[PDB]
């Protein structure tokens, strides 16, 4: 019989038996209907086939199961989506992102300097969560001492996306958006008058097909970026490092061969899949990998389930930094493939290389089974990860 699960319930994703449920789905009903009838593509094949059919599986109903579309690229279909993405892409060209390497590395070393003399830290609180916020904060002009404020707003907003909020949490979300809107419109006005080299400046100057981003669009697209910058990467940093520490052979491999880091980052992404699902709305009735779907309903793409699909990944419950190929779907696939993927990979690489070399005997204090995952139906990962190491002096 099927697992009795609610794929819109954040408690499902905080369960370490979610992958057991996914396994049943992939073997018995690849396009699964949960206890409320919500449809979800669980196999790699079904996720890819849906991604490759955007006219049938649309983003224009919004990418959450019971929330409407907002006016940002991830809730748009081509051709409108393509224009918006080309405009925002000015901030994510390969050279611009790669040029951030020194500044990201300096943030990593500052963060490690803050804990390296202690011999213990909470890897989540002290390294994984602050780095992506500092990177995106610096892109958005956030003063270092205001990063925590933006982190709070981002947590509020991603909680809204990750549940069906009460009235008070709805109000908190709207308040956080109002504050973000105010800050960003102040930045836009300043940069339109006096451009710098930050993200709003680059986005204001972006022009495609004679078109430019309006103030309204700049607020919404930078919001999408902020909540990608500071609520996703953190979970791959923590969860991926956790697997290195749980499997000491993997830690040891990376420490003696830094050239294995690119493959290690890809396996951290496969394993952690911080984005647990994106929704698609059906534009027509269709028989999809054995399940009848109805026009107007939403289907989940279960990216973590796809990333553990034995049809594609041999021994998927084995964490193997050398996996080749490793064509995981943590960033999705197709027209909406994560625009920030290069920046996320760069953050992950730079922080992990420094953790390996500066905290070389890093160990978990407690085992995985007592480390909770955040209840959230959208983006999730570890709440806390106490680690110990031999102390060392800061770089400065
Ligand atoms: C490990 C970190 C991240 C993960 C796992 C992740 C995952 C994803 C996924 C699954 C999608 C949708 C793909 C689809 O439906 O096929 C997406 C889209 C997007 N991501 Fe990320 N993301 C991450 C980091 C980032 C960062 C750092 C940024 C910005 C700096 C960012 C910006 C975006 C944008 C703008 C889109 C929308 C693209 C479009 O609709 O065309 N993401 N991301
Ligand atoms: O900005 S949004 O209109 N929509 C939105 C925002 C973030 C994400 C999460 C995400 C982004 C990129 N890579 C991976 C994951 C998805 C969709 C919005 C934000 C907060 C609250 C409601 C809507
Ligand atoms: Br299938
Ligand atoms: Br659209
Ligand atoms: Br920037
Ligand atoms: Cl199509
Ligand atoms: Cl396995």
Author numbering: 3 to 398
Any passages from the paper?
A combination of improvements made to CYP125 expression and crystallization conditions during the synthetic optimization of 1a, in addition to the tight binding affinity of the dual CYP125/142 inhibitors, enabled us to obtain high resolution X-ray crystal structures of compounds 5j and 5m in complex with CYP125 and CYP142 (and compound 5g in complex with CYP125). In all 4 structures, the pyridine-nitrogen of the inhibitor directly coordinated to the P450 heme iron, consistent with their type II optical spectra and the binding mode of 1a–i to CYP142. In contrast, the conformation of the sulfonamide linker in compound 5j directs the phenyl substituent away from binding pocket of 1a -ii and introduced disfavorable interactions with CYP142_Met74. This conformation might account for the weaker binding affinity of compounds that contain a sulfonamide (e.g., 3g, 5k) or amide linker (e.g., 5a–d) relative to their benzylamine analogues (e.g., 5l–p), and is consistent with the comparatively weak affinity of CYP142 to fragments containing a sulfonamide substituent, which was noted in the original SAR screen (e.g., 3g). Binding interactions between CYP142 and 5m or 5j were exclusively hydrophobic (and metal co-ordination), while CYP125 also formed key hydrogen bonding interactions with the amine/sulfonamide linker (5m/5j) and methoxy group (5m) of the ligands via Glu112 and Ser217, respectively. These additional interactions likely contribute to tighter binding affinity and improved inhibition of CYP125 verse CYP142 by 5m and 5j. In all CYP125 co-crystal structures, the pyridine ring of the inhibitor was rotated 90 degrees relative to that observed for the same inhibitor in complex with CYP142, and the orientation of the 1a–i pyridine ring in the original CYP142-1a structure.
